Subunit: 159 residues, 8 copies
């Protein structure tokens, strides 16, 4: 049963959001990966978000670009933590994505990650760190992940 | 009597800006309603408002919000009516967050966006009037009178006041 | 007889504005598609805008890039609704286009759409939603368009 | 009694913003500690604070700083706990330097970033509460009550006051 | 006596900025006219002003506007005279909208653009003077005197006043 | 004898500044085209600018990118009109170039044109419009240029 | 007694910012001179100042200016000494024009750039001190004491004052 | 024994930081070139910076991109001068890198250079100018470098 939902506005967003999917798989976190469009499927979004907690989801990772409303509107309909990934847009390079996700008025939060693939990977890692608070086996796997990441950095660059 | 434009805004704070749209529609004798609808705090209210707007006889929606401003776009997601968006000026980023949040709609769901702040609220009312005037000759005449007076009221030279 | 006029500053703008043309054609909205340069053909612009209403146009869609003055100056000369499309510029990625179109002082409006092809498509859709207020057959075709757009969004991404 | 959230900030000046996180955690009855930790002036204090946070029983860290804002990211470098970042508004660049310094973490070390300023501090507390509520039914009920009251307190229309 | 520079601006509000151009041309004894011409509210006035400027004996036009600032560019579209543009500072975007609206003219129709605000108005007058001085030896001498005094008036060290 | 000097910081700037050179040649305006680096050849710059008027130059067109100081420092040393062309920089797309040229404090002006090739072409046209005030034959050629530019704009785009 | 750092600035207005560099060098007992040099109004003064700095015994130059800020870069063009640049905050663009004008030096002629405003002036003095301390053990000790006290003066928790 | 340390967050940063390495080599300045990640190897960073002075380093050049914390955190742990190079990031073109390096609060300085390769070259040259204050042979080589740079600028561009 999935405990993280990864949602994104379109197939084009998957080039970015696949990095969240891959990370959750590496850490053996059960998850679902879906397309939900805030603008084209607003009722699908409302249903997805309002039923997420009763379906057993613990965290939602939502990615969108441009006037990026998917994470904020998801958070409007769920008390679950919602993490937002700004997808890089063609013209404004994700600055529109970033501001339309992070600048939520007080009362409905979205935890926002970096523009692009780094943000997708980090949304998955942040979801993992949330789940690790209550899952000791996962906490150990996350500590192994962080230890390997630290230990694997080379000491000098190659030409 | 029945409203043909709906003005919606995220908050009482937003009304400092959106009141200019309200006032201008009244000046042009366009029946309208003026409401608070919060995209984030009242999302079900928004869905219901937008999806029933056409059947209630509304022709245009003017929506204003600031920051991560989702109200105009999500309204447009649920109505086939034209939606006009006013970016309300935000404290830190001066409405640039508001502007990009509203204007950068992906293809398929439009929001016609006006200037940041009071200028945009005034112009949203005027753009709504322009839309309605296509089918309403009396309003078209009032709008033409408005534009003519606006043009006639521009002086030829500025006033110097060194005091 | 055309009821929407699509105008643009140059041939180079057509790579963007063709998306408005295509959408109007799909919805069977009679329209004209023309080049009008605010800076190189200012008298052509004045004549086009001032005669638009008497020629039977209902909406003007105007696209331009850089210091983009075509939509605003069109609106100066007509009481018709004018919709502006910021064309992506090479250096500043349409941010110059966007600010020079959207930041109209009160008194002369331009309804502005997104930078680039999305904005061109959406200007056509916004024009359609305006015309649909008075044309029941078009209103039904626009509702079919929106219904198909909603229904066609996949539920999950493909690898 | 023992804290489960740590709120850390770079300076007393930052507390004008971060006090909103402190107040909201108290309202939701979430035990927490509220501290000054300077990334640049007390880097060893930061390393020790972050690396011992989990063993001390903390579950979430909320970190706020402005300008070249390194406190949230460097905290995240030393803890496996979720770190939430609040960009404190800076004088010249209005928190844009704060925001980019915090949110643009390269892949591998996350900071969940909230809005510039007081809005972000309030929302960092609410996001922390959302995280804790996953395992705490009493808190989940308090959070649901909070959201319900927030929704119920939005009026239907704005107030006009021309004075 | 007859004007050789025309200073045009979109509004009375713009004159708070453009008055500095007016004052500096007077100081340099350059005959000029100072007018309000609105690109959006008086577009026919603008077309007539620009297309007749050369035949009326004008040599340079200085045009100032803010926001979506179209006055300098549209003036340049209708005259072969050099047009200098002053971006007037706007409230929300601090004249960045004004600046990009004026300076980013596509190839074929130039506007020589000066700094945002009063600095740009002063420098538009000085640039106009530089242009006119090419053909007017008396003015060239006055301009050289101006620059010499400006240089001579810079002190060697600053003043400390802790009070 | 040259009456316009086109100067630029480096060979790399010539990809942009060649458009000024071409325009002046088309209009038969005698000119010189040179490399002068504000940062690498500051004494060359001082000498060039301070002697420009006595050498018979009427206008200087100066192009530079990044922290672009060439136009402003030229204007510091000459009473001639100085026109500045922001060269597009790799990272910041000429926004650094633009702000470092246009934002001159009052007292020493630089008339600034658009980022990139458009700005180079327009600096040449603006120089031509300055020279045309005193040269009737050139004024007629400039009016022909503007008339041809206006007349040559197509009425509709090609697919 | 003889100065080893030169602080130069474009104007008296700039001294509101650059005075912080002056004060901090005095606190660290670093002999220095503090001058106004205008890149645009006194370009020959600048050339002479920069080209003679090394022979006069200066080791570091701290230069501050705003807007289209050319003073640090042109100083660096004429001296082989390290030049540190302080972007002075500008009115409209909040020092972003100052910052990009100073930091974006093409390869070959460096300016070590500090933060916009007073923070940058303080840090230019500290960076100059760090450079001088490489060869001056007494100054190195004073700088180490400064950093130690700075660290020791950071409290563990903030002060709440609801009044 | 190295007197300059060049450090960078990752192998990917070396495409930029190699230009600092090359310049120091040209000027015969002994140096070390290393990878140190502020986020993945924070203890490596603390150790590197705190021991730098006792190891005989005089200047540290630190390059990083995105949320770029390496230079500032290095400066937190050393009294040596720290020079920061903003590495160009994919989405925001190094503007995130630049602001996260240059905007240091008073008390802990980082001398910041341009975004990208120019900044890396200039960090090396600025380090050289610092070392030249105390090393007469190096001062002469740096003056030769600057003289050659000045003398080598062409007088006119090539087509
Ligand atoms: K009058
Ligand atoms: K009520
Ligand atoms: K004096
Ligand atoms: K204490």
């Amino acid at each position: 049963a999935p405990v993280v939902g990864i949602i994104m506005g379109s197939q084009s967003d998957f080039e970015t959001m696949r990095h969240a999917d891959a990370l959750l798989t590496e850490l053996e976190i059960p998850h679902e990966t879906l397309i939900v469009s805030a603008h084209r499927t607003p009722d699908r979004l409302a249903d997805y978000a309002r039923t997420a907690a009763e379906r057993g989801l613990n965290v939602i990772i939502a990615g969108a670009g441009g006037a990026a409303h998917l994470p904020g509107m998801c958070a409007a309909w769920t008390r679950l933590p919602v993490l937002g990934v700004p997808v890089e847009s063609r013209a404004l390079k994700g600055m529109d994505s970033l501001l339309s996700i992070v600048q939520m008025p007080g009362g409905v939060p979205v935890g926002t990650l970096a523009i692009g693939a780094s943000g997708a990977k980090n949304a998955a890692l942040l979801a993992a760190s949330i789940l690790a608070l209550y899952n000791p086996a996962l906490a150990a796997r996350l500590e192994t992940f962080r230890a390997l990441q630290t230990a694997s950095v080379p000491n000098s660059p190659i030409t």
